[PDB]
Ligand binder design. Structure first.
Ligand SMILES: */C=C\C(=O)Nc1cc(C(=O)Nc2nc3cccc(C)c3n2[C@H]2CCCCN(C(=O)/C=C\*)C2)cs1
Lengths: 282, 267
């Protein structure tokens, strides 16, 4: 296996970073046995309600999440089986792409937005190839390791779910393509809230009437066409993740043609970033 | 070349704590603050012509080996401040001292293989080496950093430093590891080591070393530099002994856990 079972004595919560999923993300510190070092980690402590065999349920799914090997998706490194289960992984210092794009609503060039879509599409394709449904894809679940390396998190949201998911709980790799389209919309709207004002209980109604999200101001039709095609009522007519990688990489080679913004640090800074924080292959 | 180093501006860094000291500087600690960002990244800071130092600093930023340290940054303001990735375990000298018991045979021999792997790389790229200058990333990954009782005889006599003079320094470093951090020539002070080396039968055999291991140490200390073994030969012989370590002297779940958190560089 690749999952390490931890004890309460070998790690400690020191702060709180946010709530999410069935638990709360707590910045932690890992203390190896017989060592004096403190290693920063991320700790997600679920809710209280479990069951005696729920741990067997969680362990089976935890083993799968500990087996992913892609630079854009991310790996579950450890777990703690207490009254409330605690999950341990590597700490992403920049948080998520949603808040990062919101707080940096200016210094986000065109190249950064298109390359983020390429990397998110690369991670989602890896999940599709491993035949794993995500179901919770969104800008809040795209973590930023370095400003040039994003990673998808929280594997297994009415305004992010496909129509077939809201109507009768149909979750497929094409339903994630819908979630990919909403995630791209949030990035290119600089963190705007989708369907702002329109209550959840009425989203399925407006989708049944042909209302998609508005074209963001910085998106040409070439980018907006891709977003709309991900939101077709026919799931099989939506583009595949392998096709999104190719088209978004095509636009990345000429970013100012496909993104219109008013107003990607040199390898000197990229080598400095990866030597300190991002030593994985890609 | 140019895209391997370019840091400085104290406006981006601060020293915060202490981790021992060194003759050339203090390791301290520190935190790097990227421009326009709110995160604090732990780094190591060595606070000790600028065109001279910068040219040599470029060279230290050009090494690409898992067991050789790259110079990531340097502030040319107060006194040559050096930036690298922070090694939480300190050096291999203190670590072997602090854990001088639960160090199995495989751990000691593989450390010698990795030091020989790093030293060979330095020879491959064409002045020190010691247990104190071997930093520990993880307890499975050691790394050579920073650039009398460790110098070769020709180095002590008249400043002759070659890749074979490092083999002498490699031999003294191996002695320190297998003596669990003992001090070489304990007691003999100031100028005198060169006198005993021209007539001596080398440093004593450590208690845990078989004759096969002590012979390698003896051959590294020959008065003829060209008769000393090559770093490429030390890798092969120490790897041979590592496959049967108890003859000559954790689980992948934990190794993957170490590297996913602290050591994401290739094997
Ligand atoms: C991909 C890794 C994995 O398997 N699981 C997860 C890792 C994280 C994580 O590292 N979150 C994180 N790191 C932070 C550093 C500094 C500040 C903050 C706020 C922060 N966070 C988040 C904690 C909860 C997740 C939501 N957060 C957002 O900002 C919203 C997008 C903050 C999580 S899962």
């Amino acid at each position: 296996a690749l999952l390490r079972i931890l004890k309460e004595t070998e790690f400690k919560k020191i702060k709180v970073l946010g709530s999410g999923a069935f638990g709360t993300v707590y910045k932690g510190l890992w203390i190896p046995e017989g060592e004096k070092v403190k290693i920063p980690v991320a700790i997600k402590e679920l809710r209280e309600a479990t069951s005696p065999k729920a741990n067997k349920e969680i362990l089976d799914e935890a083993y799968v999440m500990a087996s992913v090997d892609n630079p854009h998706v991310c790996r579950l490194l450890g777990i703690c089986l207490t009254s409330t289960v605690q999950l341990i992984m590597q700490l992403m210092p920049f948080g998520c792409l949603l808040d990062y794009v919101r707080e940096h609503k200016d210094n986000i060039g065109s190249q950064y937005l298109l390359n983020w879509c390429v990397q998110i599409a690369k991670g989602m394709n890896y999940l599709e190839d491993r035949r794993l449904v995500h179901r919770d894809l969104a800008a809040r679940n795209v973590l930023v390791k370095t400003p040039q390396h994003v990673k998808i998190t929280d594997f297994g949201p009415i305004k992010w779910m496909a129509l077939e998911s809201i109507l009768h709980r149909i979750y497929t790799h094409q339903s994630d393509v819908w979630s990919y389209g909403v995630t791209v919309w949030e990035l290119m709207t600089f963190g705007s809230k989708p369907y702002d004002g329109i209550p959840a209980s009425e989203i399925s109604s407006i989708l049944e009437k042909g209302e998609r999200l508005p074209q963001p101001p910085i998106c040409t039709i070439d980018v907006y066409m891709i977003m709309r095609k991900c939101w077709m009522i026919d799931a099989d007519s939506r583009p595949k993740f392998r096709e999104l990688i190719i088209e978004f990489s095509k636009m990345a080679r000429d970013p100012q043609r496909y993104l219109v913004i008013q107003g990607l640090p040199s390898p000197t800074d990229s080598n400095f970033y990866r030597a300190l924080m991002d030593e994985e292959d890609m």
